[PDB]
């Protein structure tokens, strides 16, 4: 995509994360593991579900239509009937394939932005209390226990609270 998160700053996805699309991984003295960001994932799902259903639901049902018999002196009309069917088939095939390709590209950019935005949310929370490393990770300069990890994920990190410790650990 155009935001550069998927197989970009993030080396690749997590096969160990099973409760969502976007999320976090953590490690501290009390344990480690993966957890999904339910708010980000559900919003991504609702957007995509509406997009898929829009493409399908806006299409009308194909109503009964069959070919027509023509006699041997009605070739001009038979050829007109065929022209109409071929023209409609060509229009719908071109549009169906091109629409899907255009929308698949946009879906992947949608996802690329959503994970990048999650990354920035944390960067803005942590400020100088952690450093950026590759693979989309923030390495803390202070002890961050399980209560801290939940606080960072929820967007409630009390930045100044940990600033004295990080200033010392940063040397």
């Amino acid at each position: 995509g155009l935001f550069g998160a998927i197989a970009g700053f993030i080396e690749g996805g997590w096969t160990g994360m099973v409760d969502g699309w976007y999320g976090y991984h953590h490690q501290n003295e009390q344990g480690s593991g993966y957890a999904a960001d339910q708010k980000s994932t559900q919003n991504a799902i609702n957007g995509i579900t509406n997009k898929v259903n829009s493409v399908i639901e806006k299409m009308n049902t194909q109503f009964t239509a069959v070919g027509k018999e023509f006699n041997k002196l009605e070739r001009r009309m038979e050829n007109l009937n065929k022209k109409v069917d071929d023209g409609f088939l060509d229009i719908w095939t071109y549009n169906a394939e091109l629409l899907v390709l255009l929308e698949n590209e946009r879906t992947l950019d949608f996802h690329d932005s959503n994970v990048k935005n999650l990354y920035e949310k944390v960067k803005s929370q942590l400020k100088n209390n952690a450093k950026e490393i590759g693979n989309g990770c923030f390495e803390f300069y202070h002890k961050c226990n399980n209560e801290c990890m939940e606080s960072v994920k929820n967007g409630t990190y009390d930045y100044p609270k940990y600033s004295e410790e990080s200033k010392l650990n940063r040397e």
Partner: protein
């Protein structure tokens, strides 16, 4: 052949039991049918790019 079955869409090659917007089975149909296209596949992505690491 005719058999003891029911469908909302019937083509000359056999009945269709589906809710998708398009079909590539046959242009001539009776009933409430998916629209006929010449496409081999119309697959849309809903998930993420599947690149683990």
């Amino acid at each position: 052949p005719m058999d003891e079955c029911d469908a909302k869409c019937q083509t000359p090659q056999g009945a269709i039991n589906s809710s998708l917007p398009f079909q590539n089975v046959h242009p001539v149909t009776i009933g409430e049918c998916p629209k006929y296209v010449r496409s081999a596949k119309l697959r849309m992505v809903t998930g993420l790019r599947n690149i683990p690491s």
